[model samples]
Target: AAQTNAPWGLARISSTSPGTSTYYYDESAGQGSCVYVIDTGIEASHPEFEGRAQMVKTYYYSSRDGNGHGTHCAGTVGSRTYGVAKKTQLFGVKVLDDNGSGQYSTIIAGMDFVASDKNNRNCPKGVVASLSLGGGYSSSVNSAAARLQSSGVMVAVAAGNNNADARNYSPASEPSVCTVGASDRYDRRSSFSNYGSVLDIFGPGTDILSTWIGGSTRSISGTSMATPHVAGLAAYLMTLGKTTAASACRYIADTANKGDLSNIPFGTVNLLAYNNYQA
Candidate 1:
């Protein structure tokens, strides 16, 4: 992607509904834009999301819904209920299948799909790509992020919940990728969050309420949850024509409300500051 300095735009709220009031929707309305979601399959039939979500593509990485990890992540990024990019289309990639695990090759296949869509004019533009999964850091994985970044694709990966220095992870540890640490609604680092100066930013990840399978709803938590909050916001910005990954990352980092990680007993970081840097 070109290194454009366009600010990540916000989302426009047509109306508010019951169920969830996500900060992302608020951020989107503040900026005025749309974004794309690439993750495990979304629950297309959920009330907050039905008709609200349109799919560009779908891939099956896993065959069974073992623990609903992908569904939870999808809810955070673009579930129909007050989603960050409520107006944006979601592209589903099931790299982990139903087992909550998949090979690097499967993940790369998804990345290849993203790269192809980004370059192919016949296909819709993918402003942001969210990968909420990561393993221990690998040089090869970091290289993948660099290639995609150079191609104008913004890659957001989750910092593992291991609470170790983020440097231990692959794509998240890669400087080219936006590595997200988890925070609560209070903006304090979640006890389970892994932190490091290298961790790019933080987002609401604890006890987040989102859509579940079988037309249900529930609250779950993880760095996985936090990853999509940023992703959803990035997508909404895309709707406003903020197309490149760096622009999106810059927008969020700039706008976020800042907090000193050292002040709190558990520490804190202002991922919300990104909202103020509206470009």
Candidate 2:
């Protein structure tokens, strides 16, 4: 049988259905926008990106996505098959190494780069930064991410998978950043996803299938995977003339699907990410 609606997180965001099988998005929502994938670098050769993915800078061994996590997140953010903003540009800002571990200094370097990436400035759809990595509270990292957002970058970050109050996490705890939590296919909060008042929104994160290393695909779970969905939606909104970081953030929070999730921790916003889409 054919599944009428299915894009996993992609489809879930555009529809109010707690159980969806179809994804309907405006074809050109993020056509001229760009997003910075700040994690493990992306494999620019991946067919899934159709040459849309490129490395802007790297503190790791190289721009190659040895960890695969960055590629997977980027796939969901802008790839043709698994992405939310299919036409948006994917700029890889590699900070973590192949082991998916990095020091705060390394991570902040990438954030600083995006903060001053003037070459890609003033794009029609605007710029967004996706941070899928997090750790215990770090004032520097939090300030860097917050600064990036204040610089007019629609920044989306993971709330961590610790299953604790997101306030203990750095970028996630930073009120200036859009911290994202994880929800599953049933619109239920993922058991391992961190929560609390810091979470700006929830997104589909379980068994999310996206492009991986070596031109293949993989399905993984984590709040890391959920943040990109919000970032991609920011790009979509930016392309629609929500050009400023504030405008995009306000739209997402105001227009999100409400009360569709279950088992979410108290203090959490109880909001799920949404993208205005058509059939």
CA RMSD, predictions in order: 7.2, 2.1
Query: Highest lDDT among the candidates is held by which one?
Result: 2
- The estimated TM-scores of all candidates read 0.77, 0.96
Task: List ranges where model 1 is wrong by over 4 Å.
Answer: 1-39, 52-67, 120-126, 241-243, 260-270, 273-279
Stretch of 10 with least lDDT, candidate 2: 1-10
lDDT of 1 by residue, 1-279 (tens): 111221111111111211222233333431332233445555565665655444445556333334466666766666655344555555555666565766676676667666676554322334567788888877777777667666776777888898778888877788877788876654457778887766777766677777776777778788887787778767665655554566777666765655633223333244442432223
Q: Looking at model 1, how many pairs of residues clash?
A: 41
Candidate 2, residue 95: lDDT: 93
| Local distance difference test values of all predictions, in order | 0.60, 0.87
Q: For model 1, what is the alpha-carbon lDDT of residue 93?
A: 59
Residue 126 miss distance in model 1 (angstroms): 5.3
